[PDB]
Amino acid sequence: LQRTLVLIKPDAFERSLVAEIMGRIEKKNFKIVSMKFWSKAPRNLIEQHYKEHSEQSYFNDLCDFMVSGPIISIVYEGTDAISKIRRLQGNTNPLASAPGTIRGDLANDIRENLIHASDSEDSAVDEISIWFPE
Amino acid sequence: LQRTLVLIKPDAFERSLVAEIMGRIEKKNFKIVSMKFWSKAPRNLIEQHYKEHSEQSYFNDLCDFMVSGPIISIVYEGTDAISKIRRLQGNTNPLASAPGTIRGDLANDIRENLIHASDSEDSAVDEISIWFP
Amino acid sequence: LQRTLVLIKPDAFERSLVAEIMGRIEKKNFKIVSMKFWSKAPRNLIEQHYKEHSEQSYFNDLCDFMVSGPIISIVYEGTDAISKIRRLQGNTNPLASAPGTIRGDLANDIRENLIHASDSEDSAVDEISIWFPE
Amino acid sequence: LQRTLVLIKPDAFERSLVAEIMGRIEKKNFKIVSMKFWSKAPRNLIEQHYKEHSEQSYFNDLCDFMVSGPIISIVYEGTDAISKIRRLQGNTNPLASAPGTIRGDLANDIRENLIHASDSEDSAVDEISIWFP
Amino acid sequence: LQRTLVLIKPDAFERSLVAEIMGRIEKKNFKIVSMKFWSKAPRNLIEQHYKEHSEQSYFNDLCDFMVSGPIISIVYEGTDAISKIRRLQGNTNPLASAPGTIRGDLANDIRENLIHASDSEDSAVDEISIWFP
Amino acid sequence: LQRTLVLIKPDAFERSLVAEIMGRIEKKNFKIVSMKFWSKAPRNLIEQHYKEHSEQSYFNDLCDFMVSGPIISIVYEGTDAISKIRRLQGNTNPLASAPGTIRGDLANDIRENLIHASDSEDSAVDEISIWFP
Ligand SMILES: Nc1ccn([C@@H]2O[C@H](COP(=O)(O)OP(=O)(O)OP(=O)(O)O)[C@@H](O)[C@H]2O)c(=O)n1
Ligand SMILES: Nc1ccn([C@@H]2O[C@H](COP(=O)(O)OP(=O)(O)OP(=O)(O)O)[C@@H](O)[C@H]2O)c(=O)n1
Ligand SMILES: Nc1ccn([C@@H]2O[C@H](COP(=O)(O)OP(=O)(O)O)[C@@H](O)[C@H]2O)c(=O)n1
Ligand SMILES: Nc1ccn([C@@H]2O[C@H](COP(=O)(O)OP(=O)(O)O)[C@@H](O)[C@H]2O)c(=O)n1
Ligand SMILES: Nc1ccn([C@@H]2O[C@H](COP(=O)(O)OP(=O)(O)O)[C@@H](O)[C@H]2O)c(=O)n1
Ligand SMILES: Nc1ccn([C@@H]2O[C@H](COP(=O)(O)OP(=O)(O)O)[C@@H](O)[C@H]2O)c(=O)n1
Ligand SMILES: [Mg+2]
Ligand SMILES: [Mg+2]
Numbered sequence: 001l002q003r004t005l006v007l008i009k010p011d012a013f014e015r016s017l018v019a020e021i022m023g024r025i026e027k028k029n030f031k032i033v034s035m036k037f038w039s040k041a042p043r044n045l046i047e048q049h050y051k052e053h054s055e056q057s058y059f060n061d062l063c064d065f066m067v068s069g070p071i072i073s074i075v076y077e078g079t080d081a082i083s084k085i086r087r088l089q090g091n092t093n094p095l096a097s098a099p100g101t102i103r104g105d106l107a108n109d110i111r112e113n114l115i116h117a118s119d120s121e122d123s124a125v126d127e128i129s130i131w132f133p134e
Numbered sequence: 135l136q137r138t139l140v141l142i143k144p145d146a147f148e149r150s151l152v153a154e155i156m157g158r159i160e161k162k163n164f165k166i167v168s169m170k171f172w173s174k175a176p177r178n179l180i181e182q183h184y185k186e187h188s189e190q191s192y193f194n195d196l197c198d199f200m201v202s203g204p205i206i207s208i209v210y211e212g213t214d215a216i217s218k219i220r221r222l223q224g225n226t227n228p229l230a231s232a233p234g235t236i237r238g239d240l241a242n243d244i245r246e247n248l249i250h251a252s253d254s255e256d257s258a259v260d261e262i263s264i265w266f267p
Numbered sequence: 268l269q270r271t272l273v274l275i276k277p278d279a280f281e282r283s284l285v286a287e288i289m290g291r292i293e294k295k296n297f298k299i300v301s302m303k304f305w306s307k308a309p310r311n312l313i314e315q316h317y318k319e320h321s322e323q324s325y326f327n328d329l330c331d332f333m334v335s336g337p338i339i340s341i342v343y344e345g346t347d348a349i350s351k352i353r354r355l356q357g358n359t360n361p362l363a364s365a366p367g368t369i370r371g372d373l374a375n376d377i378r379e380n381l382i383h384a385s386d387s388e389d390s391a392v393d394e395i396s397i398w399f400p401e
Numbered sequence: 402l403q404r405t406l407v408l409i410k411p412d413a414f415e416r417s418l419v420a421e422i423m424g425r426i427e428k429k430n431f432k433i434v435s436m437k438f439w440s441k442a443p444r445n446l447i448e449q450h451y452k453e454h455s456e457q458s459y460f461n462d463l464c465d466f467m468v469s470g471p472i473i474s475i476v477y478e479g480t481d482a483i484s485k486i487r488r489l490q491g492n493t494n495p496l497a498s499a500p501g502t503i504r505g506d507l508a509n510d511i512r513e514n515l516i517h518a519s520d521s522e523d524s525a526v527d528e529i530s531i532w533f534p
Numbered sequence: 535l536q537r538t539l540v541l542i543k544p545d546a547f548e549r550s551l552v553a554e555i556m557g558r559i560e561k562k563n564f565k566i567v568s569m570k571f572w573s574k575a576p577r578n579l580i581e582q583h584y585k586e587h588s589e590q591s592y593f594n595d596l597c598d599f600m601v602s603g604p605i606i607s608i609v610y611e612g613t614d615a616i617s618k619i620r621r622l623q624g625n626t627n628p629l630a631s632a633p634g635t636i637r638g639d640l641a642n643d644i645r646e647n648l649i650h651a652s653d654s655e656d657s658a659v660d661e662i663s664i665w666f667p
Numbered sequence: 668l669q670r671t672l673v674l675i676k677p678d679a680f681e682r683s684l685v686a687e688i689m690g691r692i693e694k695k696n697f698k699i700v701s702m703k704f705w706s707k708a709p710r711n712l713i714e715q716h717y718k719e720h721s722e723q724s725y726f727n728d729l730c731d732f733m734v735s736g737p738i739i740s741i742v743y744e745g746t747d748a749i750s751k752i753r754r755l756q757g758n759t760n761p762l763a764s765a766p767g768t769i770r771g772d773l774a775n776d777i778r779e780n781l782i783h784a785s786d787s788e789d790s791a792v793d794e795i796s797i798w799f800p
């Protein structure tokens with residue numbers, strides 16, 4: 001019975017898929033524990049959230065993107081919520097994300113892929129603290 | 135061009151209809167300006183919010199219900215947002231709410247009716263400042 | 268807190284709208300109290316069910332139709348279930364049934380209109396007894 | 402058993418609502434008789450199509466809009482299609498179009514309203530001639 | 535061309551997912567041959583149905599749950615109905631069930647997983663004769 | 668950034684699944700480059716289109732099918748469209764096509780499977796030439 005950190009990304013807002021995305025998690029019975037809306041995320045939280053990636057080439061365009069529009073940060077709660085919401089998520093790569101998954105059905109880009117989801121018990125605690133210090 | 139305040143009531147959470155409702159508003163092309171998730175709204179906001187209903191016979195049951203579960207406060211923005219989002223909502227009486235409207239399709243009870251939405255300009259400014267001070 | 272009698276009509280089965288129809292009643296929170304599936308309704312129950320119409324011109328083609336395919340007979344239960352399920356139903360006439368309603372969204376014919384719904388407290392008791400003698 | 406002409410406006414394409422719109426009409430049992438897709442329509446057909454509004458203040462802006470993106474021209478067939486696809490359509494004015502209708506659900510602007518539908522019999526032949534000569 | 539037996543479990547009724555499930559099967563083009571609504575399935579059918587599970591540590595909780603609410607028994611018919619409807623269903627382990635499948639999209643629990651479906655020819659003939667003698 | 672050719676087979680029209688199919692592709696962000704609707708396709712284009720199967724036992728029945736009702740020819744554009752719309756498609760064989768895919772969800776037959784999609788780059792130009800010369 002864990003908690004994971006989801007991010008709804010600015011492309012979700014541009015393409016009006018915010019409810020479609022949250023709806024897939026909702027219909028699988030995961031409950032919202034906490035949720036915050038950001039018209040524009042502070043770049044600092046974004047740099048924090050993606051620190052493991054700071055060395056990568058895409059890290060800068062990634063950060064630009066994440067602040068280019070609103071985002072919603074949600075904490076969901078369920079049994080094995082971390083691994084299950086990741087399988088809903090789908091693969092980052094638009095050439096490997098299966099139909100049925102969020103990214104497989106809706107996304108078509110390596111960078112603008114609608115959603116972020118914690119991928120581990122440690123990833124979650126840390127990301128959740130970043131977005132929900134309280 | 136206006137802003138209106140929307141409440142997603144506890145029954146929406148119980149029935150897993152949060153996305154369904156927010157999606158109906160999203161497709162009509164309204165923008166989220168602000169949004170806050172309340173695992174349990176403090177009672178004194180609920181009585182503030184419904185302060186014009188305090189002399190009514192249902193008031194106390196309404197407050198009890200508005201704290202029985204989570205709620206989401208949202209400020210929406212758009213052309214004639216106030217009155218357009220009211221029509222989407224549908225009348226309060228389940229015997230009146232039109233099919234096609236959120237309450238018309240989804241609600242079956244005079245109290246537990248999923249959604250709130252400001253009815254006027256002064257009402258919205260008032261309610262927005264309650265949930266978003 | 269009443270009970271009403273719904274019929275899902277053979278055209279619903281032909282056009283695969285059975286789940287779509289039952290889904291609209293389900294999403295409005297009315298509960299299934301009883302339900303029976305008929306691969307072909309006995310013409311007698313059909314003649315009974317529509318007795319008030321026995322004098323009409325359409326009564327014969329109506330009966331043919333109702334037995335031309337399967338039908339499901341359901342009893343739903345809710346507050347004011349009778350009047351509410353009728354407003355979901357929509358108007359018999361394809362020139363007056365509003366969008367949003369079952370018939371307004373899905374039906375296009377005076378005869379083959381997908382669904383039947385009791386229209387009164389007396390209509391219901393009687394129809395329910397016809398389809399559910401027990 | 403009529404026929405009618407239906408346009409899917411550039412805002413549908415912009416908003417990914419093409420199937421959403423066509424699906425509502427398909428769902429009602431109306432059938433595609435013919436259908437062309439235009440990446441960008443000759444402005445002549447547009448001024449032709451909307452010739453009856455040529456005097457209106459909005460005529461020039463409306464046409465600029467109609468050539469701002471792709472459009473799809475469809476002929477639909479079925480009993481009473483013209484008047485029936487017209488109630489599916491809903492009111493031009495976003496203050497009167499009902500929930501349940503394409504515009505009531507999906508449109509929120511006086512000009513950008515996703516769909517056009519023949520309003521009468523002669524309107525229907527008139528416009529079908531324009532798009533499918 | 536086969537027949538397979540499907541159970542809509544009590545949790546489907548609790549969550550208002552009956553139509554959602556039946557619709558997923560309906561769209562894959564399978565036909566209802568028989569169907570019965572059980573406001574409360576008699577326990578001895580449930581133990582019959584799950585008779586190969588009687589030595590398992592979950593058996594008693596499974597029976598308790600299979601009578602906690604209504605269920606619908608359905609015989610479906612179609613080409614390779616048995617194995618096609620099994621894939622639609624998805625694995626039992628929520629950690630295994632694929633997105634796109636009924637359990638993959640909708641279920642979150644090893645027990646309360648919405649749906650049953652015969653796994654083989656002998657299994658279906660057996661289960662069909664239980665619910666439809 | 669590829670292009671690909673997609674056909675909506677007569678069974679889609681028969682089953683009212685045209686928007687359902689096109690919607691899934693639109694939803695994935697692929698764009699219509701051009702699109703013709705055929706009430707009934709010249710059998711020549713069909714034998715052309717399926718020229719590679721001309722020897723197969725099924726070739727004759729498959730073509731009879733492809734002219735049994737209307738079809739819609741679409742060119743789609745987007746990054747990696749060919750291979751991407753191919754996984755949306757799913758397996759020809761109703762015993763291997765996964766839930767989540769058009770065929771896995773909607774098709775239940777080896778011949779009548781709703782949609783065709785170019786399988787390679789040259790296949791794509793090849794077929795686009797046929798339908799849009
Ligand atoms: N060339 C790339 C690769 C990836 N990304 C972004 O970097 C994010 C995180 O990287 P990655 O780990 O590869 O994707 P995730 O699926 O989110 O996996 P995780 O965060 O758990 O590592 C992706 O969501 C994507 O938006 C990017 O902008 N450009
Ligand atoms: N010319 C007609 C008129 C109606 N009917 C059928 O008769 C049924 C019942 O008649 P009507 O009462 O007009 O329609 P309902 O909307 O079902 O209203 P109710 O049964 O409550 O009277 C309709 O559902 C329709 O299928 C028909 O076959 N041919
Ligand atoms: N008899 C009533 C009437 C209203 N109510 C609740 O009180 C709220 C305010 O009522 P209202 O008449 O202003 O209805 P709306 O403004 O929400 O349409 C409604 O949304 C209902 O949820 C109730 O519990 N019992
Ligand atoms: N004030 C207006 C009114 C309409 N229009 C556009 O012009 C079209 C013709 O208006 P109309 O009154 O015939 O509306 P419909 O026929 O589309 O219902 C509308 O569909 C709008 O797209 C506009 O640009 N500005
Ligand atoms: N550990 C378990 C395993 C199964 N079950 C239930 O027992 C049923 C039979 O289990 P199964 O392994 O045959 O799963 P399916 O055949 O339903 O895929 C499952 O559908 C579950 O609902 C349970 O309650 N606890
Ligand atoms: N045994 C078969 C196999 C395929 N077909 C049809 O012929 C088409 C070509 O088969 P294919 O193996 O290239 O399948 P896809 O390319 O469509 O995935 C299929 O889409 C079927 O419609 C058939 O009629 N009989
Ligand atoms: Mg009020
Ligand atoms: Mg007009």
Ligand SMILES: [Mg+2]
Nearest residue numbers: 586651652653
């Ligand atoms: Mg088993």
Ligand SMILES: [Mg+2]
Nearest residue numbers: 759784785786
């Ligand atoms: Mg091939």
